[PDB]
Ligand binder design. Structure first.
Ligand SMILES: *[C@@H]1O[C@H](CO)[C@@H](O[C@@H]2O[C@H](CO)[C@@H](O[C@@H]3O[C@H](CO[C@H]4O[C@H](CO)[C@@H](O)[C@H](O[C@H]5O[C@H](CO)[C@@H](O)[C@H](O)[C@@H]5O[C@H]5O[C@H](CO)[C@@H](O)[C@H](O)[C@@H]5O)[C@@H]4O)[C@@H](O)[C@H](O[C@H]4O[C@H](CO)[C@@H](O)[C@H](O)[C@@H]4O[C@H]4O[C@H](CO)[C@@H](O)[C@H](O)[C@@H]4O)[C@@H]3O)[C@H](O)[C@H]2NC(C)=O)[C@H](O)[C@H]1NC(C)=O
Ligand SMILES: CC(C)(C)c1cc(S(C)(=O)=O)cc(-c2ccc(Cl)cc2)n1
Ligand SMILES: [Ca+2]
Ligand SMILES: [Cl-]
Ligand code: NA
Ligand code: NA
Ligand SMILES: [Zn+2]
Length: 806
């Protein structure tokens, strides 16, 4: 019930929302069907439109008008935004030359530069260049401020998950808005874009910027806008709030545009119909900036112009139907479109089986345009699993396509030409970032970054402590003139043991054999030196990784590689090695094919054993430092130590062996040497964070050897590739992966072919940030470089995407 008989007199766009049944006059009252009876009359005036004209100048105030052109309008804070241009001979902001804003130039009584976030739905990154001729205001913000060539959204690349990620710095799996449509099985409730369930607070996790601000005594404008409020009124409302007395005036504001997404869905991302929506958005930006200029705030406020996601060409005919694959299509519920999510239609159906659904959807048609995954097997960079609102079965849909359950869903539930939602590395889904104002840099281009980083920066711009989030605070310090956040490296928690030779060969009963009893004061001192760390500067180039949790581990040195060996997990946490451009690949010699060697520095009780692998008919083994890249026949023996061995399914060994034998050398050739750190990952509860020992679900049969769910590598070289990786004077360059450790290659439909035709494709799909590996391992990398820590934070957030140029 709403008692709509109250009034909006002196309450239009009030900031504190009133509770039912009292009627509302706020930004969202229309969305709740709750506005007072006179809200339209008083708060949505339209008379005489939005622009001053010559004959209106100095008019007698008429309170009915949508905006004013009378002499008193500046003191009232309600002139039309072009008032000074039309009536007082001023220029439009867009016509003024750009001039650096070295310090805030703010009116008396301003405690901090306000922040205005201007968000645009469906604003594909390439519109900044492609549309630049029709967007002069936006192009000025872009060229004069700080801009990225594109900003990466979160998956899925849908509006509500991305707006709420912008607000919170959280992945959707953590903030809980994992789609525009959701079912939560604990609430037994459904969330939809249409209707009332979405306003319930139980869906919205984390702490969004407006709450962070309010809790710390910084007043916020209402961020949300009912779709029917025209954009001109939204801007005039912001501008009126900026005229409030100091004690009443917000310091942070948001505008949102439903364009260009609205037209993009109808016309495609580059339909000829798209130029007009881009012009209209640019006109709105001009209204804001002219309005700020009238208020003498245009060199005071920080403005962020930011998008939620891009837009791709998608038409009805490019739809895959689950009814062409499944016998049981009526026993499943599908959340359809540019991603698929499947669960049982009925929890009482005991014949429902996810394994048979996945198999029926796997590599069934030659050009199949989606791929099924259990959610824990999705690329870890998506961070899309740890939430009960995310169904166990996920379909990753190829760009330009849709998946649906049955054909009747697509013609009885063809008009549209654009959509979005795909994998967040796809070029068409990239969106925009420009920052302009005293706190941002002047005429500065920054590399692409992820939208999870922006909450921390918005907190920095407002002097707020951010709530715990998934950004890496300091990684965006290079966007800022001032207000940088200068963190300190985390403290190492566990220090390593440095074991020497402490065990005789006969103390070991591991079931291993090696033909290494084939046998000098000159060369023996030399090899003792290698076991002591004499080559460690060549192979550990950025310092030892720090271990950020409590554990027992040993540093083990070798001619060609260094490792941190866990006594608890019985394998290395990390293995580090450098491969120069001139490095030679060799074979594993015949007599060494089955060689595994006890490590006399590590007790039998803390070692793996070969007998467990013999007995486990599903499990084989690989090595973390590859025997193929040994520096010499004698050094190669080190690579067969039991302390370099890790459990690997034979299907996975196909992948790993190709990476090690072929790809490492290729990268060294292409990058002028590489440094490689590789290791296992254990994430059995798919929360993106290192498992403790009691979370491990699988072991090598009969043993305490834990099976990794993933294997990583971090491949680092000199950004200036004219210098070798091991003699690099300046910035670094990195690419990483987190490969799923699976007992089949069903993910790769072409895996019956030679590894040259499918393995690198798999590795690209599973590209990762160093930061993703840090979460998953509790390790902290790049501890010892000569680079600034914020520079290293940016490096750690880099994602190598393998998409061609935007
Ligand atoms: C991205 O950044 C975020 C933010 O930093 C990281 O997320 C944090 O991760 C922590 C570890 O997973 C987690 O810490 C836990 O918090 C529990 C208390 O949680 C509540 O309070 C906080 C603070 O206000 C709040 O934010 C939480 O909000 C979550 O839950 C509600 C309701 O479901 C949602 O609306 C909201 O969206 C959010 O959900 C998300 O996180 C939860 C986990 O909390 C997931 O389940 C959801 O899927 C979703 O992803 C909560 O309201 C606390 O109780 C936990 O403590 C247990 O474990 C510790 C181990 O240290 C142990 O000492 C305790 O005894 C305790 O164990 C007991 O409970 C167990 C489980 O029932 C049981 O098995 C035991 O036997 C014991 O009884 C724990 O400290 C923190 O909450 C989240 N925060 C957020 C916002 O998500 C995220 O990790 C980052 N991602 C990456 C990849 O780095
Ligand atoms: C997704 C929610 C409902 C929380 C939402 C709605 C709207 S709306 C379309 O304008 O109602 C705007 C924003 C918003 C979030 C973050 C940022 Cl930085 C700016 C704006 N968020
Ligand atoms: Ca985990
Ligand atoms: Cl043995
Ligand atoms: Na085996
Ligand atoms: Na396959
Ligand atoms: Zn859309």
């Amino acid at each position: 019930w709403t008692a709509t008989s109250g009034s909006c007199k002196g309450r239009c766009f009030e900031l504190q929302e009133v509770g039912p049944p009292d009627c509302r006059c706020d930004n969202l009252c229309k969305s709740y069907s709750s506005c007072c009876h006179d809200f339209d009359e008083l708060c949505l005036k339209t008379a005489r439109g939005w622009e001053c004209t010559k004959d209106r100048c100095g008019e007698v105030r008429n309170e009915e008008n949508a905006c004013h052109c009378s002499e008193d309008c500046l003191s009232r804070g309600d002139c039309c935004t072009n008032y000074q241009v039309v009536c007082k001979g001023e220029s439009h902001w867009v016509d003024d030359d750009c001039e650096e804003i070295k310090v805030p130039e703010c009116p008396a009584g301003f405690v901090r530069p306000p922040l205005i976030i201007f968000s645009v739905d469906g604003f594909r990154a390439s519109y900044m260049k492609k549309g630049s001729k029709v967007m002069p205001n936006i192009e000025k913000l872009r060229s004069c401020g700080t801009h990225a060539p594109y900003m990466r959204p979160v998956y899925p690349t849908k509006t509500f998950p991305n707006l709420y990620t912008l607000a919170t710095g959280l992945y959707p799996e953590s903030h809980g808005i994992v789609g525009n449509s959701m079912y939560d099985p604990v609430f037994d409730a459904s969330f939809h874009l249409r209707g009332r369930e979405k306003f319930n607070h139980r869906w919205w996790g984390g702490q969004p910027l407006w709450i962070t601000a309010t809790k710390q005594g910084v007043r916020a404008g209402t961020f949300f806008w009912s779709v029917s409020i025209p954009h001109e009124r939204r801007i005039l409302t912001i501008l009126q709030w900026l005229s409030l007395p100091d004690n009443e005036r917000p310091s942070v504001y948001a505008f949102y545009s439903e364009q260009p997404d609205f037209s993009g869905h109808k016309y495609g991302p580059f339909g000829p119909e798209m130029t007009n929506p881009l012009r209209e958005i640019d006109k709105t930006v001009g209204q804001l900036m002219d309005g700020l200029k009238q208020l003498r705030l245009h060199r005071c406020v920080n403005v962020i112009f930011v998008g939620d996601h891009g837009m791709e060409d998608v038409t009805c005919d490019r739809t895959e139907f689950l009814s062409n694959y499944l016998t049981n299509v009526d026993d499943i519920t599908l959340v359809p479109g540019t991603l698929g999510r499947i669960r049982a239609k009925s929890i009482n159906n005991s014949k429902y089986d996810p394994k048979t659904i996945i198999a029926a959807l796997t590599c069934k048609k030659p050009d199949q345009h989606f791929k099924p995954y259990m959610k824990q097997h999705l690329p870890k960079r998506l961070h899309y699993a740890n939430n009960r609102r995310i169904e166990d079965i996920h379909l990753l849909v190829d760009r330009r396509w849709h998946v649906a359950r049955k054909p009747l869903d697509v013609y009885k539930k063809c008009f549209f030409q654009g959509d979005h939602g795909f994998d967040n590395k796809v070029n068409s889904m990239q969106t925009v970032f420009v920052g302009y104002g005293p706190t941002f840099k002047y005429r500065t281009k920054v590399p692409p970054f992820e939208n999870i980083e922006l909450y921390n920066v918005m907190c920095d711009l407002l002097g707020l402590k951010p709530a715990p989030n998934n950004g890496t605070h300091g990684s965006l310090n290079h966007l800022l003139r001032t207000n940088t956040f200068r963190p300190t490296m985390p403290d190492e928690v566990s220090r390593p043991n440095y074991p020497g030779i402490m065990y005789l060969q006969s103390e070991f009963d591991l079931g291993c054999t090696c033909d290494d009893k084939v046998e000098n004061k000159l060369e023996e001192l030399n090899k003792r030196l290698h076991t002591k760390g004499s080559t460690k500067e060549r192979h550990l180039l950025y310092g030892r990784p720090a271990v950020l949790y409590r554990t027992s581990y040993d540093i083990l040195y070798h001619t060609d590689f260094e490792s941190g060996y866990s006594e608890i997990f019985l394998m290395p946490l990390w293995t580090s090695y450098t491969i120069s451009k001139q490095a030679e690949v060799s074979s594993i010699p015949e007599h060494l094919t089955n060689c595994v060697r006890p490590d006399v520095r590590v007790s039998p009780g803390f070692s793996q054993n070969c007998l467990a692998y013999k007995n486990d008919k599903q499990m084989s083994y690989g090595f973390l430092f590859p025997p193929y890249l040994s520096s010499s026949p004698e050094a190669k023996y080190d690579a067969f130590l039991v302390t370099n061995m890790v459990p690997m399914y034979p299907a996975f060994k196909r992948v790993w062996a190709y990476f090690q034998r072929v790809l490492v050398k290729k990268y060294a050739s292409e990058r002028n040497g590489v440094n490689v750190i590789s290791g296992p990952i254990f994430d059995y509860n798919y929360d993106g964070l290192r498992d403790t020992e009691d979370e491990i679900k699988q072991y090598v049969e009969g043993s305490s050897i834990p099976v990794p769910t993933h294997y990583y590598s971090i491949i680092t070289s000199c950004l200036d590739f004219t210098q070798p990786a091991d003699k690099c004077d300046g910035p670094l360059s990195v690419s990483s992966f987190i490969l799923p450790h699976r007992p089949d290659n069903d993910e790769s439909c072409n895996s019956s072919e030679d590894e040259s035709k499918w393995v690198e494709e798999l590795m690209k799909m599973h590209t990762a940030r160093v930061r993703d590996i840090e979460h998953l391992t509790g390790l902290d990398f790049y501890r010892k470089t000569s680079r600034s820590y914020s520079e290293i934070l940016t490096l750690k957030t880099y994602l190598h995407t393998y998409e061609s140029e935007i």
